[PDB]
């Protein structure tokens, strides 16, 4: 490979890792770095924004632990009136209901915390401070977790304004997952217009934006004028 192809391969893997579903090793790494950045930044509103962001992520992490425990406790019950197929499938679906409703509440609590983290970052008014790598790192982490929290629950239309704000920050536009999620969420919205028989202007708006971010994700991972780039361009043209 060329130096650019080797670099690109390395970066795409780092970007896929960056958007990895949360776990304990990623949590630890993320917050150790954010707290060191907070100490460097020495800004009380950044400190508060981080305290709220961390509380939001903790809501998500505590929920993931709850979901395993809940499913475990149900699995360990003896179910005497579950002798027919429809009874087993019934009780499965109701388990999924309680898990989904609890995950929905955990998402709502986590987004209230993320909203507070953003409201505190909004209070940093000095443009020399808003341009700090510390400021942009935290703001990117808040939007990324916010996008993922909604994505997991299939709330794809809601992810669009946050993905769009995300890609505007410090070369985030060059991230393959960011364009993959935008393209998928736009695709959902296009399908909503087709299923609900909505207006043509919105059909084409959503289709256009899907294709822009589909092609851009392709360009970023495989390179301009790659067999894969040429293919997507030829389908669109």
């Amino acid at each position: 490979l060329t130096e650019d192809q080797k670099k690109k391969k390395k970066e795409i893997m780092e970007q896929e890792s960056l958007w990895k579903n949360p776990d304990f090793k990623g949590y630890n790494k993320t917050f150790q770095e954010l707290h060191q950045l907070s100490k460097t930044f020495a800004n009380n509103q950044f400190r508060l924004a981080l305290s709220n962001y961390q509380s939001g992520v903790n809501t998500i992490m505590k929920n993931r632990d709850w979901v395993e425990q809940y499913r475990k406790e149900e699995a360990e019950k003896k179910r005497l009136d579950e002798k027919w197929y429809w009874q087993k499938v019934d009780r499965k679906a109701r388990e999924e209901r309680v898990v989904y409703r609890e995950k929905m509440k955990a998402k709502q609590d986590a987004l209230n915390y993320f909203s507070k983290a953003i409201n505190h970052l909004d209070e940093i008014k000095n443009p020399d401070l808003r341009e700090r790598p510390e400021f942009k790192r935290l703001l990117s982490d808040v939007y990324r977790s916010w996008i993922m929290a909604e994505y997991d629950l299939q709330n794809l239309p809601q992810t669009i304004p946050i993905l769009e704000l995300y890609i505007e920050i410090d070369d985030n536009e060059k991230e393959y997952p960011a364009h993959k999620y935008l393209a998928s969420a736009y695709s959902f919205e296009e399908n909503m217009i087709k299923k609900t028989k909505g207006p043509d202007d919105m059909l084409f708006k959503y289709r256009y934006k899907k294709n822009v971010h589909l092609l851009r994700a392709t360009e970023l991972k495989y390179g301009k004028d790659s067999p894969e780039y040429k293919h997507i361009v030829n389908v669109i043209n």
């Binding site: 309680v98 409703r101 609890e102 929905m104 509440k105 709502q108």
Partner: protein
Amino acid sequence: TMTARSLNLKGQSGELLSLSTADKSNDAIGTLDAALTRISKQRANLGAYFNRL
């Protein structure tokens, strides 16, 4: 007191014409016990106060 006296849940899972939904059913009704408790006891002190007067 105001509606924010208890967990003021509006709407419910599914398709709505609002942009809000209720929370975990278990807490939702459990909250209404809290709502009723919080207001009744507030009346309780007012009751007791009347007797003091």
